[PDB]
Structure formats: structure tokens, C-alpha cells
Symmetry: D3
Subunit: 230 residues, 6 copies
């Protein structure tokens, strides 16, 4: 596969997709037994290991829709990947979204033209896989993790005129990131199961703000919720 | 309120929204104790009653986004309606969607220009309220009802060139109706809780077909799932 | 026909299309001899009768483009309907449009995405049939009815940000309703003759306002103009 | 006025707008008494004269929306022009449109982005002024001229992929030219009265074809209809 | 060819395209030896002559994209024209663009819907031919002519809400005219070489202004730069 | 700066922007004296060094418009970066583009919605800075490097329906990559100088194909052309 230097099935059915290829490293080392490293292309590191005896892979995606699309496609098409879970952060855009909250995206709004190219006249609303999502909600509530379930906004521009999120907050969108629409759509197209699990990086239209401690907690917190989701 | 001839609070916190104002009649009579009739404007009948002692309202919406939008707005704005559940049918567009299946929409794609007017450059992905949705899933599984959870397609045209649903089936969209986007968006805007619960009316790209018996079953079946959702 | 429970040709060549299925009732009873009732589906009542010995039908459409589209299509395709005249009201948006004025739409602007789906890069300007329209103008001037002839605006949302009509008034658009584009386009597509005849319901950017008396007059007034249009 | 080298009111209330600045010459010389020439800028000749004692002006527009827009704006804004009538030809796109037929545009479809720039989410349907149009119909029928009344298509490209007109013929659009939308819209914006009167230049999806004789007849024929329209 | 009354090859490989058909006259008479006149249709004059012994043609285009498109297409398709250079003016929109400056467009932004019709989801960025452009830059610097090289804006409307150029100046667009996008695109499509060379007509968001003397200089100045470009 | 862990001015006026953060490493080590490493965030390595005594920086961008936008913005806004040159590859889409050819983008088409968000009704054609571009052409021709100068296509999707490039080849677009539009636009907005320099990675609509040797040559070849461009 053009972008991923890996042997067939040297990659798990299940892949966690952080934006950062260095958090990809971190997650493997700090959470998985028997750490393999299949990919080193573009520094976009890929890893495979076990957790509670089960095989789990970890691939960094880079940032923005066009980048994650690249990896999700190859992972799916060239490695028959079955379950793809994003684990990154997002900028909180409501006030009723707390820094501790862990976010499960049912859907996402986007300004990426990825869908309009393919569909034209249709606002295409992408979709988390319920089984994956329910499992994550269950895995959250049993351990008693703070968890919100709603939509996010997959943006093309980190720095924007940003008129959008101010309007999107008014419709109950929870936060902004740059990957989810791309995951959900490509996963749905190819018959796979996708879900996006996200922590708060900071409040964009500040209601409150974040410390290094709060992130370290919610980060770890999110990885668990993901891992136990199967 | 312009379209609904009703006294303040003569309407419940919770309203079931069938497309048909005559199924609206049916549902009241056949499911609710102490049947009031608040609205008779445009034959778009509105009813209030109790079920398991609790107050439940039933308002017909008519067809298409512009029509349901009318009722949802007034119900919300003029009657502080808290929970709005659609109960209609949809044309099944996948083959793995069975005539018995009861459908819970997490989201919907639309070709209505309702959102693009307000948002512009954004594909806005509307969102069912999770609490309502989870409750419906729970109320489904305990009685053991067949139930699928994914997206639908809110269309503007019953008869189309329909090139869309053939493409939308390829992305795992479950079925086509004409209301949901409009519900989810207006509910989200005004801080209310919405959910759309749907039976199969027939298979549009026929995988299988429907009898009068199968509908009568799933219809009733869906009303229960709704009713026990609280 | 899916939505209209009627026997072949039990429906006239000519159909008046009020939004309200109860004004549909009213019009039949109060204007036509030998009243038949072909449709009772969805409470969207359909009627056939005579006037000056000639067969005339009356079908309610519901509200919004997607709804009227449904009836117009079936009426045309399943009942070879030849002449379709809308008789509803509209919100006056200029000041030089008087509450008494009866409106004949040559065309309509819309924000519905119905046309952009089919045409893409084209602003499609729909068209009243001239013969029908001229006949209505003649039938207006002989009795001496106040009558204006220009465009309207077929909206998707009764409640809007409404920035549009303020801009559209500046271009001489007369009023806003929710049906006409849909009529004109479907009528033109299938080789039929359509026309939309409208009274003022109120002034939206208030220049003046309406009583119950003024409506009763213009309503009746409009039905005549329609009826004598053949 | 930047584009028209003319003294205030040296231009009539009424202006005929042929595309060709040389037919502009022709029309003056061959139809009007006391021929003045106000404009010679860009060879886009402008003329003023009398007909049946009444003052009539004649200004060439050039081709395409952006060009006629230029003249229509200045004529309106800088010379308080009251009535603006286009007199050009169009490519017939239906078969039931005959080479002899004289065309009165109620409206026009366009692919020009002129309107979408100003309106955004609105398909804006431009509008002939009825008074002007009725007068032209009357002036046609009394002399007994063949005359059709419907819509046209204002295109941006003489040579196209042209997929549009094949689809637009299916909706009863009569013919294609390159000016009308631009006239109707600018006329409506500034409170003026516009109308577009058109002959057939040839059949684009050939049903029949044209001689030099047939044009000379219909051309002259159209100028009359225009002239007597007041 | 429909719009150009000319015999095969009575037109040069190289054609200068001023907007004004009278500057077309001027340029021929004042710059070329052995002046032929091939076209007189629509007053849109076409000329052929020699300069430094070499054959050079001069065709007026009229104004706006739809008009120049007409001539560029026929010139290319019916006369195998190889090199097409626009020589007109543009409204300067930055302040760092001086009245003396001669402008070489690498590209242009447009609001014309010409490209979106053909491409859909693509912002198509048109392209000057480098060879032509470099040659013009060389021919500029050797004589020592003030010359800027960047983008312009091909507008559909001389009079606009004009919100665009205020935003476009902020991105370094140099000036606004009404032809270039149309040239570059049609030239690129048919394998020909195009370039647009432009003087300042005035400053639109005034930084400074123009005399008749400054234009006469830069005009002549621009024709040279064009002519020596081969 | 959020994404780049660097001290003020520890970054040069001039930055080379390869997609790959590992080619970023390579370029530094193999071309620059006194190698500093300012950034290690996300493995997206940043380096500063000298070449012919002059300070030159090297920052990886990742893939797709949203990603490079991130770095270009911070580099510009937080480090007053003056000159930004992309050095990556592109998929050749014409046949007359040779594997050896080095490509200088004057402009790029895109399907990214980055511009349409900001501009709306405008196809915005981005622009290489001429000074940078000319300098690169000069630095190419003196050493005698094969070099083509035209447009490219900045895509959002590596894997597409790809109907676009087949149409875009027909208009003389040279190749497809995923960064340039984003560079040119952000550079132009902030008053900086940008240029994109690209090798062929392979032929997408295969005319010919590539070896490892041909890339190693053209790669090195391109870095020179960049480096000597100042
Ligand atoms: N736009 C945006 N705003 C935020 O506040 C935010 N917080 C996290 N992210 C995610 C998404 C990207 O992968 C990447 C960009 O830093 O991280 C954000 N994106
Ligand atoms: N488009 C469409 N296709 C179907 O097969 C279908 N089945 C049910 N519905 C819903 C939605 C409307 O409220 C209304 C239109 O009949 O019923 C459908 N809509
Ligand atoms: N938008 C809108 N504004 C008005 O003031 C108005 N007056 C009448 N109508 C028509 C059209 C609908 O069928 C229906 C909505 O009430 O009635 C209106 N629609
Ligand atoms: N597109 C197009 N097709 C035709 O068959 C046709 N016939 C006449 N016209 C009008 C409109 C222009 O002003 C001008 C272009 O020749 O003439 C036409 N335009
Ligand atoms: N829009 C616009 N603004 C100007 O300041 C300007 N200056 C010159 N031009 C060019 C382009 C047309 O061919 C024609 C319109 O007058 O001349 C301009 N166009
Ligand atoms: N779409 C696309 N097709 C190609 O053949 C191609 N060749 C190189 N590139 C550039 C651009 C990306 O940064 C990145 C994606 O691999 O590399 C390409 N992109
Ligand atoms: Cl992330
Ligand atoms: Cl329904
Ligand atoms: Cl109505
Ligand atoms: Cl014409
Ligand atoms: Cl010009
Ligand atoms: Cl690259």
C-alpha cells in the first residue's frame, strides 16, 4: 500500500487513529503488550500489539480530512481493517461541554468539500457505527467516565474567519476537529465500522480552560474507553 | 400560534409526530386515555391524552420539510414542547434492512436546501438526541423488537430522478423519508430533544416487499417503542 | 395512485389547488353542483363537481413544495389532469401591493433546492401558462377586480432568517408563499397548463394589515376569477 | 455616463435594445423620423427619433449578460429611462416553436451567475413587466402576428456542452439567447419596465430551418410589435 | 464562421484582442503596414496587417466573458489561431499598482459561472501561457517599461455590490476587468497560447487617479510590449 | 506557536516545504551546513541551516490543504517568514509532461472548499509570486534543467472518482498534488512570497512510468533549483 509500509495482516482488525504519529508511539508503548512497528513512512508511525490478549493496531493519521482519508482508505482497502476508532482531541464550542467530558460523535458537520464532490445537491450527514458507539458508552458508564454524545464539526481550517462555529454552537454542535467526517464517510462506504472518540483540548469560545494535568487524565481516560469498546 | 389552534399548555411536553393527521387520530383513540382534541386547523389534527398516567400529545405534521418545520417551530416556540418524536414510515433502500426492522435515525442526509440557506459552505449533519434514542433502543431490546440504528435520507421529492438513493445506499443510508432533517435541526436549534422512529413502507430498490399485515404489526410496534421511551 | 384514493377519470381535467384541505371542502360545498368526494387519504380531501355545467375538481395540496409536488405529480401522471390552478394566499412583501389585490404569478423565485437538484448550474425560472393567465386577467377586469401581475417567492421556511424577502421586495417580487415554483415546474415538465392565483394573507414587512372581512371578500373574489378562467 | 456619450434627456423614455449596434443603425434609419445619434462609443451606436410623433430611442447592447447589463444600468441610472424593450433573436429549442413565431418572454432561465452572486441560496426568477407584455400581445393579435408567450434561456456561452437546452426544452423553455435575464433583473431592481421580444434565428436542435427571407419578415414584424406596444 | 465574416487564413496566427472595436481600428491604422479589414459584422471590426514584416491580426471582442468567448472560439476553431493576446485596461484595485504599471496576468479570479458549469466542484484557476508571458516581460524590461506580474479579477458586472474586490485586494489581486478568465480557459482548452496585457483605467478604491495623457502613454506602451512579444 | 515548537527568529526568512517530514530531515542533512532542529512536534520536523552562507529553513507540512495551511499560517504569522517554497512531487496528468520535467506552478485548480468558504460566488485563482518563480526559471535554465511552467490541481482526495483530472488534462493542467492552492492563497493573503516546485511521482493516466533512479535525480534536481532561487 502506497503510504503504509506493511505486510498483509501484519495489521489488526482494529485500529486506533490519533492525529499525532508521536501519540501513536506513546499509546503503543504505554498500553500494549508485544509492540510491533509496521509503518515508518513519513514518520506517520504504525504499531500492532495486544491488549487483554487481543490484537490492536495504532496508526497516526496526520491532520485534516485529506490526510486521514489517505490512511483510512489504505487501511480498509489493502488491509481489510474492520474497526476504526479515532482517538484525538477537539476544541470545545459549547459551554455545557466540560473539560473532563469525553466525546462520542454520532455525526459531524463539515465545511470540507469532500462530500459535495461525490453527492452534489446533498448535505450528506455521516454516521458513527452504533455497535461501536454503544459499546463505548457502556465501557464509559461502567467505569463511570463523564461522557457526552452528540455531533462535532470537521473543519478544513484550524484558523478560520470561524463565523461557523459561533453559528454551529447555536445548534448544539459540541466541538471542532479535522478528521471525523472523513472517517465516518469512508468507513460507511466500504462496509466498515467507525467511531470517533474525543477529549477537549481547550474551549474555543472560552467558557473555561485546560491544564496539562486535565489533558493527561482525559487522554488516558479516552484510550481506556476505546480499548474496552470491544 | 398561527397554525395550531391551542390554549397554552393544553399541549404536552412530549409530542408524537406522524406525517398523517388521520394516523394522528388513530394513535390517540387506540393508545391514550382521556382524549382531548386541541387542533382542527387544516385537518392537521392535534390530540392530548395520558398513557401509563403520563401526558402525551399527538400532532400530525403533513409531508416534506417545509410542512413539518411549521409545526415543530410552533410546538417548540409557542408551547415550550420538550420532546418531539417522529413516528412515520420510510422507504427501505438497503437490502439488509428488513420489513420488520424498526428504524432509529442517528442523523439524516437531505437534499433540502433548508440548511444550506442558513449555513452556506457547511454540510450540516443534524443529530438525534441520544437520551431519547438510547431510551428507545432500550425500550426496543427489552421487549425484543427488531431494531436498526443508522442514518436516513430526508428528500424534497417523492418522485425523483432518484440517482441519489442508489448512491446513498452505497454509503449505508437505511431509508428515505421527508421529515427528519427538519425535525432534528429545529429541535437542536431551540434546545429541545428530538428523535425519529420509522417503519418500512416498502423497499424502493426492491429487495423484498410489504403486506398490510406487516405494516399493522410494525406500526403498532413503533408506537410502543416510542411510548415506552420515557 | 399512492396518495389519492380515486378511480380513473373520477377527477376533472381542471383542478383547483388550495393549500388547506378544509378550504378544499368549503370551496366544493359553496361553489359547485353535484359534489363528489374522491379522496379522503391523509385528510387531504379531493372533490369533483360542476360549475356552469362544466366539471371542476378541487384538491388540497398541503404546505411546502415537497407536499404539493406529490399531488401535482399524481394528478398529472395518474389522472391526465390538464389544467391546474392554485388558489391560496401569500404574504404581501411590497407596499404597493394592496390587501384587496388579487395576484397572478407569472413566475416565482424560490429557495427550494428542487430545481438545482435537476438542473445544477441553472437558475431555472418557472412559468405560468399564458392562456390560463390571460384568461384569468380577462375574467378579472370584466368584473373589475383589483389584480396585480408579477412574481412571487416560493419559500421552504415559514419562519426564516428572512433576509431574502427584504432583498426580494427590492426587486419587485410581490409576495411569499410555499407552492408555486413546484406547481409551475411540474406542470411545464409534463406538458400541462398551470397558474397560481393568490390573495394577501397579511403584510409581512407591514405596510398595512388584514381583517377577517377583507379575506372573506378576496378569497371568494379569487375563486370566481379562477372559475371564470375557462 | 461612462459608456454612453450622451447629454441628459437627449435619450427617450423608451429604448429598443438590439444586440447588434448595426441593426441599431438599421432600425433608426428604416423606422424613425428625425434621426439623432447620441452615442458612438465602442461603435455601440445609440439613436433617438420619433415614430407616430412619439420619441423613441434605439441602443445596441452587445452580447452576453455582462455587456447588456452595462448599458441597461447607465440608461436607467444616468438617463431615467422608463421602458426598455429588447429586440433580438433567439435559437428555437422546442419543435412547436415556428420560425414565424414572435416570442414574448415572461421570464428566463439562466446559467449566468449574476443572480446567485446577489441572492445566494435563491433561484431568482426574473420578470417581464406585464403592462409592456400585454401591450405587445395586443399589438400582435390585432395585426394578427404569430406570437408565443413563455420563457427563454439566457446563456453565458454560445458554444456550450449544451446539455442544458436539451433538458430545458423538456420543461417548455422556448429558446436561447444571452441578454434577457440581465434586462429583466436590472429593470425590476430600479423600478423600470422591461420586456424582451424575440424572433427565431434558427432551430438549435433542428426541427426546421431559416432563410434570409423568413428573418427579414419576422425581424420587421418584431419591430412593429415593439413600436405599437405604446 | 457565424460571427466573423472572414476567408480562411485571411486571419493571422496572432491576434490582439482589445475590448473596443474602435481601438481595434486605431491599433491597425496607427501600428500596422498593409491594413486589411476582414470583419465588419456587428461593428466588431477585425483587421490584418504586418509589423516588422510579420503578419498580425487585430480583433475587437466586446465586453464581458460571454462576448469575448464568442470571438476566441471562432478565431481558434474556424481560423486555427495560434496566439491570442488581450490588450485592454483594468481598474486598479491595490494601491501598490501604479497608473503607469503595465499588467501581465498570470491568472484570474472570476465570478462568472462559465467554469463552474463545466467543472462543478472545482475552482478552476485559468493560466496565461508562459512563453507568451515571459516574452512580454522580456520585451518590457529591455525597453525598461514599468511592469507588474500577478492576477486579476474577471467580473460579470461593471457595477456590483463589489464586496468582492475589497476582499480580493486583501489577497493581492491587481485589478478588475471582464475578459481574461474567458480567454485563458478557451485558449488552454484548444491547445492555444493566450496572454492578457492590461493598463490601468483608473483606481477603483482610489489610491490615485488618471489623466488622458497617462492613458495615451500606457496604451501605446502596452501595444509595443504586445507587438515585440514575438 | 501552537504547532511549531520554536523560538522567535530561530526560523529563517526562507522555508522549503516538503510534504514528508522525513524528506525534511534528508534535505537538511544532505544540503545544509550547521543543522539546527527547531521543531519535533508531531514528528513534523523543522530544521534551519546555511547554504552558500545564507540561512535556509526546512519544514515538513504533512498532506492535504488543511495540514499545510496549519504550518504556513504559523510560519508566516508567528515567525514573519518571507519566502515559502514547496518542494514535493505530483502525479503527472498530461502526456507531454515528462518524468524528468521539473514543474513550476503559476497557479492551481482545486476541489478544496477552502476558498469558496471565504469568497462564496468567486472561483479564486491563486498565484505564485513572479519574482520567486522567474528566479527559479532562471536558476533552472542556466544549469539547463528540464522545466515546465503551468498550472496544477490541488485535490482533497488521493483516491477519487477522479473524473476531474481527466477533464483537467483536457485544459492543460500539468499534475495533481494536495498542497499548492493552500500555499499560494495564504502567502498572498499575508503579503508573503510563495512558489511551488514539483517533480513527477508517476503518470496517473499513464503515458510513461518512474524508476527509483529517475526520482532521486529529479528530487535532487528540484532542491537545487529551489536553493539557487535566491
Ligand atoms: N480546528 C480545531 N480547533 C481546535 O480547538 C482543536 N483541538 C483539537 N483539534 C484537532 C483536530 C486536528 O486534527 C488537530 C489540529 O490541532 O487537532 C482541533 N481543531
Ligand atoms: N420519498 C419517500 N419514499 C418512500 O418510499 C417513503 N415511504 C414513506 N415515506 C414517508 C415520508 C413522507 O412523509 C411520506 C411520503 O409518502 O411518507 C416515504 N418517502
Ligand atoms: N411564508 C409565507 N408567508 C406568508 O406571509 C404567507 N401567507 C400565506 N402563505 C401560504 C403559503 C403556505 O402554503 C401557507 C403557510 O401558511 O400559506 C404564506 N407563506
Ligand atoms: N446561444 C444562442 N444561441 C442561438 O441559437 C441564438 N440565436 C440568437 N442568439 C442571440 C443571443 C446573443 O445576443 C446573440 C449571439 O449570436 O444572438 C443566440 N444565442
Ligand atoms: N469592472 C471593471 N472595472 C474597471 O475599473 C475597468 N476598467 C477597465 N475595464 C475593462 C473590462 C471591460 O472589458 C471594460 C468595461 O469598461 O473595460 C474594467 N472593468
Ligand atoms: N493526488 C495525488 N496524486 C498523485 O499522483 C501524487 N503524487 C504526489 N502527490 C503529492 C501530494 C500529496 O502531498 C502527497 C500524496 O501522496 O504527495 C500526489 N497526489
Ligand atoms: Cl487529534
Ligand atoms: Cl410518515
Ligand atoms: Cl395557501
Ligand atoms: Cl440579439
Ligand atoms: Cl478592455
Ligand atoms: Cl509532496
Amino acid at each position: 500500500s502506497v503510504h503504509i509500509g506493511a505486510e498483509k495482516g501484519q495489521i489488526a482488525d482494529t485500529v486506533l487513529l490519533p492525529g499525532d504519529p508521536l501519540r501513536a508511539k506513546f499509546i503503543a508503548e504505554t498500553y500494549l503488550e508485544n509492540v510491533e512497528c509496521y509503518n515508518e513512512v513519513r514518520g506517520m508511525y504504525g504499531f500492532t500489539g495486544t491488549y487483554k490478549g487481543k490484537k490492536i493496531s495504532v496508526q497516526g493519521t496526520g491532520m485534516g480530512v485529506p490526510s486521514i482519508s489517505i490512511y483510512v482508505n489504505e487501511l480498509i482497502q489493502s488491509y481489510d481493517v474492520q474497526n476504526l476508532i479515532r482517538v484525538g482531541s477537539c476544541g470545545a464550542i459549547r459551554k455545557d461541554v466540560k473539560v473532563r467530558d469525553v466525546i462520542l460523535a454520532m455525526t459531524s458537520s463539515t465545511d470540507s468539500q469532500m462530500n459535495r464532490v461525490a453527492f452534489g445537491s446533498v448535505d450528506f450527514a455521516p454516521c458513527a457505527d452504533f455497535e461501536l458507539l454503544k459499546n463505548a458508552y457502556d465501557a464509559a458508564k461502567d467505569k463511570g467516565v463523564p461522557v457526552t454524545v452528540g455531533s462535532v464539526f470537521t473543519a478544513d481550517q484550524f484558523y478560520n474567519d470561524d463565523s461557523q462555529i459561533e453559528k454551529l454552537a447555536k445548534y448544539g454542535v459540541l466541538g471542532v476537529e479535522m478528521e471525523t467526517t472523513a472517517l465516518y464517510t469512508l468507513a460507511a462506504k466500504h462496509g466498515r465500522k467507525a467511531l470517533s472518540i474525543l477529549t477537549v483540548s481547550d474551549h474555543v469560545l472560552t467558557g473555561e480552560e485546560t491544564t496539562a494535568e486535565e489533558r493527561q487524565t482525559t487522554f488516558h481516560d479516552m484510550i481506556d474507553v476505546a480499548l474496552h469498546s470491544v
